[PDB]
Amino acid sequence: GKPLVVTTIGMIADAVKNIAQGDVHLKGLMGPGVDPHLYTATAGDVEWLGNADLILYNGLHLETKMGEVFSKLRGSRLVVAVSETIPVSQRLSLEEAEFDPHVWFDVKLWSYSVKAVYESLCKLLPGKTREFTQRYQAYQQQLDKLDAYVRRKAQSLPAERRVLVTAHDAFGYFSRAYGFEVKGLQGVSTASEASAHDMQELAAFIAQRKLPAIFIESSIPHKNVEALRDAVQARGHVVQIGGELFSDAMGDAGTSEGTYVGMVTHNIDTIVAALAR
Ligand SMILES: [Zn+2]
Incomplete structure (x- = not known):
């Protein structure tokens, strides 16, 4: 067998x-x-x-x-x-x-x-x-092709616009490999929620840096990043939720997002589209 x-x-x-x-x-x-x-x-x-x-x-x-x-x-x-x-x-x-x-x-x-x-x-x-x-x-x-692709897509975005804020701090390696500045509402681990302080600091970061978008993830309830977006607006800055990213899990079976190559491709495409212009 x-x-x-x-x-x-x-x-x-x-x-x-x-x-x-x-x-x-x-x-x-x-x-x-x-x-x-x-x-x-x-x-x-x-x-x-x-x-x-x-x-x-x-x-x-x-x-x-x-x-x-x-x-x-x-x-x-x-x-x-x-x-x-x-x-x-x-x-x-x-x-x-x-x-x-x-x-x-x-x-x-x-x-x-x-x-x-x-x-x-x-x-x-x-x-x-x-x-x-x-x-x-x-x-x-x-x-190998995926790595080269992600790198081209990243380089197609103005350096100043390569600032990625997500549901949790899951893109530290992405940051180093592709030239992005990253921040997450929750930490590297989701074991604990972000404190009220953590949220105000990130809201301040988003408002002061005037970021166009922030992202939700497929494995963390959207509620929190949405509450974050609200905190940013209460600070005089309008930021939109640029899309949903796959951080710790992939998409559904049968879809390209349900594969490693498709998961990463989805992420870079989604990020670049939301951060550009
Ligand atoms: Zn994680």
Whole structure:
């Protein structure tokens, strides 16, 4: 029979789909709209995890509530935190007390994670190494093209206009790779809401910098960024909500936004369209 691969975030499931295709059974625990920072594994999830031959998760403490679940499963199956293969020097350190887990927004950096998915699959099914390698090389070429595309789109926007404010601070790697100044209403983790103070400071930032738009996300209730937009207006500045971005989760299955390449493409197109003119 075919082995079972269980993944957390959809971005990782996307890599498994492209590299392993039908050679493995794939179960993604977190679908569209799911916040990985706040996610608690259900009993059904733990069942799937307990039957998996390979478990792939992000690491870098993204899945803040699943550490123990993963801990207890090592020793009986391959468990790989794909993003922990990214060199420490390339990770963004938060006040020397945590690493930013949103590595998928620097496409070149994400190639390390994709390589880990590919290599883990080869360990799982060594007999499939050749086809996995062909599919992986094709997928990596798509990612190379995606990186170049995002960079062109970013460069098409005036430097002064490259200021991105979103529902939470998920674009730190995007900021470094593509030349954007970024701020989020909630922090790198969504574990805590933004305080009244945090909101006034960001509202002041938005008003003083005279930004054209701010963005909502598919995994955080729109209510908060909408309340933020209101605070900005009470400060004499009119900012609009430029669109909804995919931060921690991808779009629906069947749509291009339900793929890693489509998710990123949607984000850059949406951002550039709202920030331009
Ligand atoms: Zn996040």
